[PDB]
Write a protein that binds this DNA or RNA. Sequence first.
RNA 1: AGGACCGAACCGACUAAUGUCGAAAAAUUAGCGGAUGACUUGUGGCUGGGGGUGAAAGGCCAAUCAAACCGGGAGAUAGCU
RNA 2: GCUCGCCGGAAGACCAAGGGUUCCUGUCCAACGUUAAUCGGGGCAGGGUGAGUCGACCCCUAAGGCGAGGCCGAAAGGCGUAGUCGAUGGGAAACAGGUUAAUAUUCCUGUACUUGGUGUUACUGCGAAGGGGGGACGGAGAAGGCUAUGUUGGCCGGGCGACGGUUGUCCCGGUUUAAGCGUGUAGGCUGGUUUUCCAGGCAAAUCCGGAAAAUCAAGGCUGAGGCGUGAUGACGAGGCACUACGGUGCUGAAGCAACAAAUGCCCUGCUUCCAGGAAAAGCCUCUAAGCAUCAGGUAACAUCAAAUCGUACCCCAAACCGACACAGGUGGUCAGGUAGAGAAUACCAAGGCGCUUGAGAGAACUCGGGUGAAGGAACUAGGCAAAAUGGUGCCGUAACUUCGGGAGAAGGCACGCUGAUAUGUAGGUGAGGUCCCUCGCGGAUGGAGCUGAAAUCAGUCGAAGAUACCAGCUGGCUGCAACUGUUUAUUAAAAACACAGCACUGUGCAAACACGAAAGUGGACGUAUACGGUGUGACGCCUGCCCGGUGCCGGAAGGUUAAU
RNA 3: AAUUCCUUGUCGGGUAAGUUCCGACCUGCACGAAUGGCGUAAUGAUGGCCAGGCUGUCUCCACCCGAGACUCAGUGAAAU
RNA 4: CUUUAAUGUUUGAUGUUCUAACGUUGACCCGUAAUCCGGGUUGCGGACAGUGUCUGGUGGGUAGUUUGACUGGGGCGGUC
RNA 5: CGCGGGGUGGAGCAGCCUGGUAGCUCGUCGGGCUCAUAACCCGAAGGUCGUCGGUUCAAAUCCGGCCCCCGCAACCA
Lengths: 46, 271
Amino acid sequence: MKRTFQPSVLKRNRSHGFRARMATKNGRQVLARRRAKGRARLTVSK
Amino acid sequence: AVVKCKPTSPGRRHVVKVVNPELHKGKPFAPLLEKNSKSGGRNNNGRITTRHIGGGHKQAYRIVDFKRNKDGIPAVVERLEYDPNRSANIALVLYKDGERRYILAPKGLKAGDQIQSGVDAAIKPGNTLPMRNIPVGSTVHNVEMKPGKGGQLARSAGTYVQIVARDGAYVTLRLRSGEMRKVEADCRATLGEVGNAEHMLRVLGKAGAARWRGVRPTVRGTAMNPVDHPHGGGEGRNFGKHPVTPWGVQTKGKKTRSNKRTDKFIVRRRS
RNA sequence: AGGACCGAACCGACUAAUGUCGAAAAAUUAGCGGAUGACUUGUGGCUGGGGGUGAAAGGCCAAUCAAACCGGGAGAUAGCU
RNA sequence: GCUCGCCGGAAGACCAAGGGUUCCUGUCCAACGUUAAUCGGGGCAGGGUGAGUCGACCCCUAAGGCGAGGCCGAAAGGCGUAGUCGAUGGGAAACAGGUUAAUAUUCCUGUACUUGGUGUUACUGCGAAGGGGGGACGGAGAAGGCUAUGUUGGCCGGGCGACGGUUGUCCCGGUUUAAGCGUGUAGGCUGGUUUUCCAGGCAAAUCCGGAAAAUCAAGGCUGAGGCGUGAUGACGAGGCACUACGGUGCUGAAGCAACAAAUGCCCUGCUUCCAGGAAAAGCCUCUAAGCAUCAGGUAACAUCAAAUCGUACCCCAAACCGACACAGGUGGUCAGGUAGAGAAUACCAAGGCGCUUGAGAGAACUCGGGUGAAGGAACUAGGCAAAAUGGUGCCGUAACUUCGGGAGAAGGCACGCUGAUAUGUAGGUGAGGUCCCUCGCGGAUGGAGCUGAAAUCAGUCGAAGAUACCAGCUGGCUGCAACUGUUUAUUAAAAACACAGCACUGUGCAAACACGAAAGUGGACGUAUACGGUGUGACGCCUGCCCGGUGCCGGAAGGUUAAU
RNA sequence: AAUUCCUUGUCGGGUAAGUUCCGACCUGCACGAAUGGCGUAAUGAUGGCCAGGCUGUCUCCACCCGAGACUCAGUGAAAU
RNA sequence: CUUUAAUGUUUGAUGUUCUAACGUUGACCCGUAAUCCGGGUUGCGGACAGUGUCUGGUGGGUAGUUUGACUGGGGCGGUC
RNA sequence: CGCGGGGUGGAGCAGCCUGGUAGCUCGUCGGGCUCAUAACCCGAAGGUCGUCGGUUCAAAUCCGGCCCCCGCAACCA
């Protein structure tokens, strides 16, 4: 079969990355809630 | 000249190609070419605004001098060329001062004939001049609408409009569709008629024959489901409804003309 | 020259058998169609929920679609079990 | 360690993606491994990834994204100019041998190249976000010239051999060499040079383009491979010698010729047809605003710099995605021998594996298959499944037909090996000799050698000669749909969809129409031989009657008629 | 008839036997001329029918070679 | 009261002409290497077009809902 | 089996909705026009209103049973 996960780290960071999240208003609320819940690895990064 | 191909294969038995050895068999004038990345019917938001458009072959852009701003300058029609974007031919015209410019190729024209523009040009196909300097009843094309805009009317293959009269300030024309539109005397026109009239006799023959041209397959309304179109549904292609567009607007007879800002221009409407 | 022919790669997936708590949350084997084209494919982008996209089946949209998933209205309502 | 077996256009060797030490060594066996385990991708401790020339970072951009002002919008925010990012694209430069338990186009040895900085000597006018050229490009086909590579012969070295022959037309092994430089070829492109003038290229211009004279006939550009050099260097089968018996150290002959021939290269070619096939920078060059005893540019030499990061291992899989050590999926390059048209297939070379449960029994029954007396579809919803035809050349081939097809129709004949034609022919290739020359990688002539189909005849062997793998069932009538194509990913691939063609109708362009509160865009940098929608679905023959009902269009006098 | 309910209508062909097929008769429950009609060479992993060839489909199954099934040793589920 | 006649006066409905509102997805220039935009010239239309408010009409394109019960199962029929 | 409609001179159809009165065309008979027929012209005749019964002053009409004909329905498993 052809599963639904063909990894490519560049695409992983251009749609879910830190600077991609910071690019919008609602995106900033995402990073806010992550810090609200007290998560160590906020978003997908190195 | 046209040609009906011999049935050497299924699908090929109907094709008709319009050929003319006048066309330069090589690469065009590069300095007047710019790119043209397509759209496929997608706007700024990317939504498909118009259907059936997309695909096709990569085409370059040939800048055509519609302003015809050169004045009182002799020009030799160097070599006729093939143009992707349009339906007619485009002639590479070389001027006396050494400035090469592309222009829409009319009928009465060959690789080596003389032309000129301005208000002093003679009455020969290819010559451009304001409509108040052209005799009543003649043939012209590439007719402008606004003074110095460039040209809006009759630019396609085998297309020409006929000046019906000239009442002082206004110049009445009989458009290609069959209108009676008044255009100001400051607008330039090109005498003669656009060449390659057999374009309308062109038969594609293949499904892909329209594919690489840019056309994508259309889906009939009766074949779809009641959600995606006002038509569709039922058991066995029933219709029972007045034919409309995919957005409920009545088709097959319905004036959608709503301008009113330029209704003083059109004297008689289309037949 | 050919949306040409036979036929590998490659793509697709008509028939049967096995498989059905399988090796596998649609696979394998033995036969199959296309195979210079409306072909196929890697990478990189783009369109989004009453919308997107669709050679149009109401198919597909992260195994979920006649309206996805996550959280909040909300301990919804329930003459029902 | 010795045999057997298996893949071999992969189950081989290398990269990207993505993983993240899974690589190596020592040590250990509880847990992981579907069994034991002193074994391992498992634990613990340690080691290993060395770059000016590879890639990325960098320069320059495409799709597309963001976006100073600005347009617009309850707010959020949407769009977009200047600019700035963004490769999967273009742009400078390195190859051979050796070396580790593990990395090396990175280390070492040998031999070179690329772009800048500074300084000096000798000349000389340089110089932009500006102009021009270049970069720079489509699909297919045929041919010519070569290479990787392979085969044979020569040469060199070893052997002459556990059952009969085997010093001979015998057998086995090796016969390798790049980057760069010099030369500039087969082939390909274009007529050069000098002078004058110009509303031309946002201004200018000696650069390009164009318009006229002139002189001479070639010059110039581009370009695989070959020949020298690189290189009396390395490598090299095999010996010579120490063993912790893993391998280390020393030494080292031949190293040519011919033929066949790529999907590789010349080719980013040439021809043809059409659906007519990116951008910008690096680079070359001309000038503006200016600056000139300056400054800079060209050339040569010397010297310095070339920074940062990745570099292990896996890479068609026990390490990626699939919950697993999962018969699935995963892009790119190299890709040999014999037979063969071939990357099919068959058996093997290089290399790597025997798939992490086995040992016996040989029941029904189940799965994968083999063969089968007589009959031959009586099976059954139905010839589903099997069986069968199956290759090349020649003979031969109907109804019908859009004159292409139908058609590889059907149905048949000849196929091994040996010798002869011919101590291997037609043909391909091609050295020496001879001759000429605008003397070189030249052109004729010349024919050794190498290599090599098919046809014909005769003879002989088997039951069977396309003896294997591989490899069409055919014909007749007919419904439906024209045809290739597309779809229910994962029970329906069709008579459904699309289709070219046809028709009606809407739209005169700030167009109809569509998304969007708006702006702005798509439509189109197109314009009625165009574009949107709808309906039918090649082509041939046609396509009749009805305007009452519903809708649409045209005409508005009168009745009625909201707000005011 | 992809349309025909009645119906397996009637007639002729094909078979020893034909509700299917093929060619016609028109009695069209309820075909019909771009929600296109009637034909058509080529084409179809399409529907239906017949013949030849071919064979284990079958009459009626038989034997044999492999992988399980059984036994021994180790590990060790499941639905209910 | 009806028919009518000149004038003053009160406005409405049309025709025509003009430029200053406004539009300008025409040409030119500048901010500026910038097809955005804005300002200044000029040409063309022109008190139209367009926008807002109120309002008539059309309108399944879109949204929220009804779509009865008994019934010797429900539907049809029939009843209330 | 149910719903609705219909049955009228010899034939084909109105009149029924809202009970006292039945029409049109063709056809038939007889005469006339022509030498003869049809057509044309003129005049007259012909209806137990499917059947029985009833409510009613009065029934073709309004209701009930029955007969025949026509269309629709006769369903989902």
